């Protein structure tokens with residue numbers, strides 16, 4: 001009887017931050033209640049000021065990271081306000097049946113729905129909108145996020161000993177396909193319906209115009225750079241709902257990586273770069289050993305540095321000259 | 334002495350079905366005899382009626398799945414009838430030496446050949462045509478399939494206990510490169526030779542015009558949807574001879590996955606989506622837990638829903654409300 | 667005290683060859699001294715005579731393979747002669763801190779620098795130039811290589827028993843983006859600065875014009891084919907600093923593969939084809955069992971046979987008819 005289980009309500013937070021949770025489950029299985037409100041909105045995605053009509057869960061690209069434990073039930077209230085124009089739904093890759101919930105959650109503007117599913121498999125998983133006939137358009141307009149289903153006894157290393165993270169961040173990587181004309185300029189559209197065919201044509205090139213973290217070029221830089229201290233253990237959850245990516249921490253490693261994101265498997269050790277296939281979430285654990293600026297990138301470096309898939313960590317602490325040093329600084333002989 | 338071994342003749346079946354076989358070997362090592370007849374033919378590949386000159390093993394795209402056991406010998410009689418126009422051969426990724434057999438199997442129209450090789454490594458493997466100088470053209474015109482070399486004691490899980498499948502299907506995913514003009518219309522050609530340079534130019538874009546399962550958009554839908562019952566254990570073998578893919582069962586999982594298809598390795602557990610690199614076959618095992626329609630897709634969703642890489646499962650049985658339920662059906666408040 | 671450790675100087679060799687080293691460490695931890703001189707030079711990259719302005723470490727594409735043992739220190743003297751025009755640096759994926767050394771190694775023409783880092787993680791790793799603001803241009807102009815950090819007790823199999831290679835080769839795979847005009851002809855440029863914007867535009871297509879091994883179409887063929895004898899154990903280290911690749915030995919296998927290149931992990935067994943993500947080095951171990959010509963390719967076969975990512979092995983020794991034989995040679999019935 002699900003009615004006999006504890007209920008807990010979670011208020012979600014904006015990526016790259018993650019709602020408060022416990023790694024090791026302090027209660028028995030629970031029904032965990034989430035609410036998301038769909039927001040269609042204009043978003044500026046690059047330094048040039050290119051503005052798209054984005055489709056979002058909870059006002060952000062990506063949608064927020066949900067965190068539960070294995071064999072919890074997820075109960076999502078999904079609200080489509082009448083200020084929106086399109087039909088939406090949600091498909092959880094964590095869920096079993098009914099197209100991941102998509103068949104049960106179709107909401108027109110002015111409607112809401114509540115879905116419950118049992119999180120039977122531990123791992124990080126993508127969720128995304130998937131309305132019949134228009135799936136890639138919604139996903140590539142930003143309507144995707146992730147859910148983490150932790151093992152009830154938390155994460156474990158390749159030998160089965162505990163791994164505990166001190167901080168967690170969620171990086172959602174988004175491929176956008178802004179339509180271009182013969183000259184190569186971005187085309188502009190008045191209504192979603194007038195945009196649709198050109199959006200399909202742009203998608204069929206399989207060549208994104210932008211590939212960004214947290215919804216825009218430079219979103220995870222400057223005042224919004226990720227932070228850590230030397231010695232801290234950081235988990236970075238990374239998703240890509242549509243297209244392969246290959247994350248890399250410039251100056252660091254993935255000490256333990258679940259590249260395809262599923263915690264019953266042993267992690268890969270000491271990775272430089274890891275492949276997260278399109279339609280997947282992955283997770284990487286790293287202990288910082290040096291201070292300074294790190295770049296966190298998709299290591300197709302054109303995708304990173306020309307198309308947008310690059311963010312920064314600012315790390316505080318002591319410099320270790322045993323690990324790295326300048327022996328002779330750049331100079332003319 | 335190979336002449337002292339049992340011989341068995343197999344008659345192949347059209348994908349996505351697979352010839353009858355035993356998972357656990359009921360005889361000692363055998364010579365397993367297969368015959369394939371090459372057929373060059375017109376094929377309609379999409380709903381628009383786009384027709385290509387396809388190159389096939391046994392009349393289908395993909396070619397049929399061959400199944401043997403580790404350390405069996407495969408003896409293939411390959412027939413190129415005089416109704417065909419081109420030179421063909423075959424390269425087995427399962428085989429050792431002579432370019433996988435390609436150096437030994439070159440047949441002009443009106444010729445045949447018989448190759449024997451020892452299947453020394455267990456796994457699912459690609460086979461494809463590979464005539465010197467024209468390899469990608471033949472492979473991307475459909476001339477590829479797969480072979481499964483089962484361990485003699487069948488499949489095993491990550492802990493070494495038996496995994497037995499109830500049903501098996503073979504999904505071959507094909508990237509086509511139909512030449513386009515400046516306007517973006519598909520060009521049409523009278524002879525293979527007149528097509529060749531434009532085919533090469535289209536291939537060099539690295540952007541497929543179509544990506545399909547079982548030879549056409551929608552081939553694994555409707556009356557030809559895959560089927561299962563709740564509780565059945567299904568193995569899906571998936572190959573891609575030329576280009577990476579990332580299969581996903583919408584509403585399900587890969588419970589046990591050999592993403593790069595080789596059975597001496599432990600399977601990955603609980604996958605949402607798995608990467609099968611171009612030039613590889615993989616295999617995924619799933620036990621259905623919910624009825625209804627599932628979509629089986631390449632989770633580049635543009636590739637799936639715009640370019641063709643999507644099929645369906647129709648699953649019969651009981652709905653489990655513990656696993657998933659609509660709490661409040663879509664409605665206006 | 668690092669000053670108390672042995673020092674050894676290594677003189678590097680041109681790929682695909684590798685400097686002499688010992689698999690199992692015969693000394694304690696050492697400081698291993700390398701020197702590289704940057705050379706900007708014209709290179710002919712294809713059979714058509716297309717000539718680019720290449721940027722190289724030590725005069726080659728890829729840069730040379732460096733080999734050390736876990737917890738050795740790498741001390742690199744990097745020289746940028748005044749005959750060069752651009753600013754360069756180096757980022758080691760093996761290193762920890764300061765953008766892999768990139769923040770500490772910026773050298774203008776006429777300058778040099780010496781970096782030291784501790785090789786704390788065993789595996790094969792990419793190194794590449796990464797000057798702020800111009801990273802992908804330098805990497806995709808050839809300025810990348812790899813470093814192998816061997817475990818001190820050498821390589822081990824999936825069960826922890828020793829694997830010893832008899833020969834080692836280094837294959838660097840390079841994606842080039844030669845700018846094209848409306849007609850599709852390669853554009854030509856007088857100075858690096860006049861080339862830059864068109865280089866960026868060409869990179870943003872995400873469609874390489876050339877994908878080559880050892881710096882040119884056909885570089886690892888003919889008189890420069892790789893060689894082995896039947897029974898020899900060969901390690902092939904393969905890197906791709908920017909773009910995914912999927913190596914395959916046509917007629918063979920990867921007996922033991924570290925696809926993402928990190929030796930604390932067990933190898934994948936019996937691979938047909940393996941995915942090395944962009945920004946990664948991998949390693950594959952194979953024991954040759956048949957003589958003849960093998961092709962070693964990226965198994966996107968368009969990338970291999972149209973764009974250049976194909977080389978040869980010439981293997982000497984006895985033919986094994988048990989493994990493969992022609993039963994009936996091609997003939998007309």
Ligand SMILES: O=N[O-]
Pocket residue numbers: 061062063142143144145171172173174213214215
């Ligand atoms: O929603 N993609 O970050």
Ligand SMILES: O=N[O-]
Pocket residue numbers: 046209210211217306307308
């Ligand atoms: O930031 N992408 O053009």
Ligand SMILES: O=N[O-]
Pocket residue numbers: 326327328329
């Ligand atoms: O870094 N002092 O030459």
Ligand SMILES: O=N[O-]
Pocket residue numbers: 394395396475476477478504505506507546547548
């Ligand atoms: O032959 N490709 O499915």
Ligand SMILES: O=N[O-]
Pocket residue numbers: 379542543544550639640641
């Ligand atoms: O179905 N592909 O255009």
Ligand SMILES: O=N[O-]
Pocket residue numbers: 659660661662
């Ligand atoms: O689903 N009943 O509101």
Ligand SMILES: O=N[O-]
Pocket residue numbers: 727728729808809810811837838839840879880881
């Ligand atoms: O430098 N790439 O082989």
Ligand SMILES: O=N[O-]
Pocket residue numbers: 712875876877883972973974
């Ligand atoms: O060899 N590439 O065009």
Ligand SMILES: O=N[O-]
Pocket residue numbers: 992993994995
């Ligand atoms: O190969 N002799 O027919």
Ligand SMILES: [Cu+2]
Pocket residue numbers: 055087088089129130131138143
């Ligand atoms: Cu939507």
Ligand SMILES: [Cu+2]
Pocket residue numbers: 091093128279581583632
């Ligand atoms: Cu999905």
Ligand SMILES: [Cu+2]
Pocket residue numbers: 388420421422462463464471476
């Ligand atoms: Cu053929």
Ligand SMILES: [Cu+2]
Pocket residue numbers: 424426461612914916965
């Ligand atoms: Cu092949």
Ligand SMILES: [Cu+2]
Pocket residue numbers: 721753754755795796797804809
């Ligand atoms: Cu440089």
Ligand SMILES: [Cu+2]
Pocket residue numbers: 248250299757759794945
């Ligand atoms: Cu890098």
